[PDB]
Paper text:
Residues 669–1100 for each monomer of PDE3ACAT could be modeled except for the loop regions between 779–799 and 1029–1068, which likely adopted multiple conformations. There was also clear density for two DNMDP molecules, one in the catalytic site of each PDE3A monomer. The structure of PDE3ACAT is essentially the same as PDE3CAT-Xtl (RMSD for backbone atoms of 0.38 Å), with only an additional two turns of the C-terminal helices for each monomer modeled. Almost all of the amino acids in this sequence interact directly with residues around the entrance of the catalytic site of PDE3A through hydrophobic interactions.
DNMDP and related compounds, or velcrins, induce complex formation between the phosphodiesterase PDE3A and the SLFN12 protein, leading to a cytotoxic response in cancer cells that express elevated levels of both proteins. Here, we show that PDE3A and SLFN12 form a heterotetramer stabilized by binding of DNMDP.
Numbering used by the authors:
A (entry chain B), C (entry chain C): 669 to 778, 800 to 1028, 1069 to 1100
B (entry chain A), D (entry chain D): 551 to 560
Write the structure that this text describes.
């Protein structure tokens, strides 16, 4: 039973909203409402738009039919859980596209692929698409589309503690990420109709698969500090980032996908609050399952005593904060020149959200102390 | 952030 | 359909040959002939003898019935392939027991478990059993019993190149070792009758599982040089090996299981030749499968043009040689004082086998040059 | 030992 894509591959009614694909605060939920929750074609349409903008369809002679069929199957694979659904995959794909394509102040540029929304005439800006080969960029985009495939709505710790079959299968080593990559590649290789990489040679296909698997496995938060330390050590080196080195480019792609996977706190207030609501709903479901199983309820997963503000503040200060700081210090953070200083929307939004959470925590503590 | 690391597994 | 062990748990007819379990050149094939190839109870009987010698049955209150049932199921799991069969598992278990228990000259000793064949009165010798806790030793023995479980007779490279389902499942990352560990633990957790660790608490069971998985995954030869480099760096440090550190003990156990997995060249001439014949038969079967599939025949796997001597010489000089040298330099190699110098049977056997292979290679080259 | 490393995968 092959899950073939709907006959209209391109939806014209979305052509307006896709025009806002060039801004960081993309109204993705409005796109979900426009497309419809039943069909769930958001990821396929967004991926098609991004591939057209890059031109990877003509660069690699990618067949449209196979690409659309496989991405529709990938959309079907995502479960209807509050956070790790196809909406999150679309958001991560849009974020990696934004990070790779949008101008970066002071980034020197060296086949290669450039977005149609980038101005090559200007010499004061650069983009990661001008330093990363097209094959690696396509691998990064595909991995971002595959980063959380078939997510069960549970964390790695819950699966390990409960001795879930997935945990036993992968020997309690990056259970979620390994499962996502394995399921995505099994789906890709299961049907001939999903093979949109038929025009790649044997060596290129192997390299693409390796890059996609590495990028997917980089999304694990258990190894987050390892990646952060490695990236900081590479950047602080006098040599710096070498774009002619395969390992450095792989590390840069892994950092980009890691930053895009937790980009929620770095958005505007409305998107950040909606993503926080989704993730805390998923946490509450996991905590209810833990209570049913008799295990002690994990922190922040108790619906009776929510700690949403504390969770968000800790996540921003410990996970998102250092990662964004390292990415900006490396010089890969998109921004604009102000007249010379650099203005970044992502960093400003992260600071504003962190201040909001600190204010909420202080207000809650004051209210508790009064009572 | 003991609780956050416990959730993550670090 | 639980695979329950035969009603007689202990075989008396073997009690004589088990007396030779205290020597490195254990006639394992004679034991296979005595027991019988149909029943395949060699691994269970050898494991029972070793556990009785250590006393882990009384130390951890291990039930005999569950232990025997699970080890018989483990024996059944091993396939009848020329090399990676239950005979290899028994050999590796005997080798890890020999390395951990037999006296080591100059090794200082610090619950703990000592073998019944060790003289504690003498102060000039030590054993790894006196510095490694009983739980870690049991984990090492179980991992050695599980190191190559359900081996398909093919290398990691063959599985990756042919896009085997096991390779896709584990994302081309230690496919064989991950499969072995996952299958062994799934078999252990599948039936209540195989749970011989019921007397361990929750934390101890988790630590035991972690140690077993780490030891099993250490057996991969793709990461052999990584482990060798890490061990050399730890040993060359002025601090040296710290037996009070969990990480150092885990590394020592991993090195022991790695050395025991390739102990074949370190044995006497007859055992080494038999193991070489088995491994080259497995290589020839793999090469025949590669030729059938149309892939180019891998080196040393061409039955038409054998290179057995070259393969053995390369394996000894590149894999077994440096590993044995590092293990001996660390000071963990068993031996005896000669009157003060240290005599090691393992190193002498390895040198003799390497010289034999060099002589064979020189003779073959001379014969080829004459023609 | 190019052939040995190719077999191992290094
Ligand atoms: C599954 C990963 N993870 C649970 C451990 C997680 C997912 C999403 C968010 C999250 N929190 N806030 C948001 O704004 C949306 C996303 C980024 C946080 C976590 N986390 O580590 O606790
Ligand atoms: C499967 C591991 N491996 C194949 C790559 C392998 C197994 C066994 C032996 C082997 N060779 N000689 C012997 O004496 C018996 C064993 C140790 C060698 C290899 N190898 O790396 O080529
Ligand atoms: Mg994830
Ligand atoms: Mg093995
Ligand atoms: Mn994710
Ligand atoms: Mn082995």
């Amino acid at each position: 039973k092959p899950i073939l894509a709907p006959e209209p591959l391109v939806m014209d009614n979305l052509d307006s909203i896709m025009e806002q694909l060039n801004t960081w605060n993309f109204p993705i939920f409005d796109l979900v409402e426009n497309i419809g929750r039943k069909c769930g074609r958001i990821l396929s349409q967004v991926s098609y738009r991004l591939f057209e903008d890059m031109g990877l369809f003509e660069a690699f002679k990618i067949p449209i039919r196979e690409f659309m069929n496989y991405f529709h199957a990938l959309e079907i694979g995502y479960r209807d859980i509050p956070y790790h659904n196809r909406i999150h995959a679309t958001d991560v794909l849009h974020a990696v596209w934004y990070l790779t394509t949008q101008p970066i102040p002071g980034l020197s540029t060296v086949g290669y692929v450039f977005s149609k929304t980038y101005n090559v005439t200007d010499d004061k800006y650069g983009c990661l698409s001008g330093n990363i080969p097209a094959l690696e960029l396509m691998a990064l985009y595909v991995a971002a589309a595959m980063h959380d495939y078939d997510h069960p709505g549970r964390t790695n710790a819950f699966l390990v503690a409960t001795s879930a079959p997935q945990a036993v299968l992968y020997n309690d080593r990056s259970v979620l990420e390994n499962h996502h990559a394995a399921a995505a590649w099994n789906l890709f290789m299961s049907r001939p109709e999903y093979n949109f990489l038929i025009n790649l040679d044997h060596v290129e296909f192997k390299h693409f698969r390796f890059l996609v698997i590495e990028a997917i496995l980089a999304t694990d938060l258990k190894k987050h500090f390892d990646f952060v330390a490695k990236f900081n050590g590479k950047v602080n080196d006098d040599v710096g980032i070498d774009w002619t080195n395969e390992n450095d480019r792989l590390l840069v792609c892994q950092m980009c996908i890691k930053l895009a996977d937790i980009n929620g706190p770095a958005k505007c207030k409305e998107l950040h609050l909606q993503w926080t609501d989704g993730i805390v709903n998923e946490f509450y479901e996991q905590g209810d399952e833990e209570a049913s199983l008799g295990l002690p309820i994990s922190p922040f997963m108790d619906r009776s005593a929510p700690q949403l503000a504390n969770l968000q503040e800790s996540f921003i200060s410990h996970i998102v904060g250092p990662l964004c700081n390292s990415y900006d210090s490396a010089g890969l953070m998109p921004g604009k020149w102000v007249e010379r200083k650099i203005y970044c929307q992502i960093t400003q939004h992260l600071l504003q959200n962190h201040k909001m959470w600190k204010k909420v925590i202080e207000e809650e503590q004051r209210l508790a102390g009064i009572e | 952030a003991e609780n956050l690391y416990q959730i993550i597994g670090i």
